[PDB]
Structure 1
């Protein structure tokens, strides 16, 4: 254990040195062991998709191609499946749910976990610290601004933000060339 700890620290030093030179960044220890693209592949996600070590993926989660799954994210498919499209940006700190335990806790542990399936289309952006709750359906080409709480379905080509989130305009201008 003495030697193992010393080896782990040596490895941390060397790997951080290598990552600074090669990738001009410094990551957590775990993100220097885990490759983002191989992890996504192991999870059955589409080609081009990437996911940080620090991400938690529960139950039935399906993800399309070229989707970026950021650090400190939760993709919870435990309550009937979560489906995410292609080309999505799932920003740092985003949490996507198909269950909750409000009643279980509030009832002293008696009530069951409530569950509902959740879907996000393609070409979406979920901004930092966005919370998407069970049951929600988000369409294609939606923007969800940072610090949102999405309680209801969102149709395609919408821009939403707030806690709770509300439709603010269409997303058309972000789709331009």
Structure 2
């Protein structure tokens, strides 16, 4: 707990955190400390578990990112961080292309190589992972995850906490419900309800 003045606190110290740390540093931000349920990651000290959050706030740190891949858990930890007085920053790699008409929430991760086009809306705590494409007029719910190299072809709505695996694709105009999982490589050609798993080309719900 001896820390510099002013950087970003990270919740989570795993592989996702490594990537987030590098996005932040590529933008010139400083990462102050990690809190992890196992109480360094790329040189950032792990100072305790989530019980350390009040102490971090008290010492003047007020900016935070939740680097937890699990969508439901990330969402819960973002709420906890905000209750403790932290503001949720975004971690947007400088190579990502984010159109000027995109609406971004808070606590959003946007990895290297991403493109997000016109009039897309990105909810709080979303992850738009490495190389993913979000075409025009998409709506991404809070705490969803578009996995690496996934692609949404415009007018796609993705529900809260939905997860698209590596290389998933969605054709124009499709809606995917909250809490749904699209497997790696799945090609979604019809609306998906909430709380299902869909896999394949074309993607099919698996009971």
| TM-score normalised by structure 2 residue count | 0.53
Correspondence list, 1:159-170, <5 A:
159-169=197-207
2:193 to 149, 155, 169: 155
CA offsets 1:99-145 (integer angstroms, 9 cap, x no match): xxxxxxxxxxxxxxxxxx22111011100000111011111110111
Counterpart CA distance in 1 for 2:28 and 2:188 is 31
Give the structure 1 partner of residue 181 of structure 2: 143
Q: Which has the larger radius of gyration?
A: 1
CA 1:37–1:149: 2 relative to 1, 3 Å: same
CA offsets 1:156-175 (integer angstroms, 9 cap, x no match): 11110100000112xxxxxx
Please tell me whether residue 83 in structure 1 is matched to residue 136 in structure 2.
no
Gaps in structure 1 of 5+ consecutive residues: 1-22, 99-116, 170-177
Gaps in structure 2 of 5+ consecutive residues: 1-16, 30-88, 93-97
Correspondence list, 1:51-130, <5 A:
51-77=110-136, 81-98=137-154, 117-130=155-168
Work out whether residues 157 and 175 of structure 2, in 8 Å CA contact, stay in contact via their aligned partners in 1. Answer: yes
CA 1:164–1:50: 2 relative to 1, 3 Å: same
Please tell me whether residue 32 in structure 1 is matched to residue 70 in structure 2.
no
Q: How many residue pairs get matched?
A: 125
1:48 to 96, 107, 128: 107
Runs of 4+ in 1 over 6 A off after TM superposition: none
* Cα RMSD for the two superposed structures: 2.9
Work out whether residues 125 and 144 of structure 1, in 8 Å CA contact, stay in contact via their aligned partners in 2. Answer: yes
Alignment partner of 1:60: what SS? coil
Work out whether residues 52 and 70 of structure 1, in 8 Å CA contact, stay in contact via their aligned partners in 2. Answer: yes
Shift in Å, 1:63:
1.1
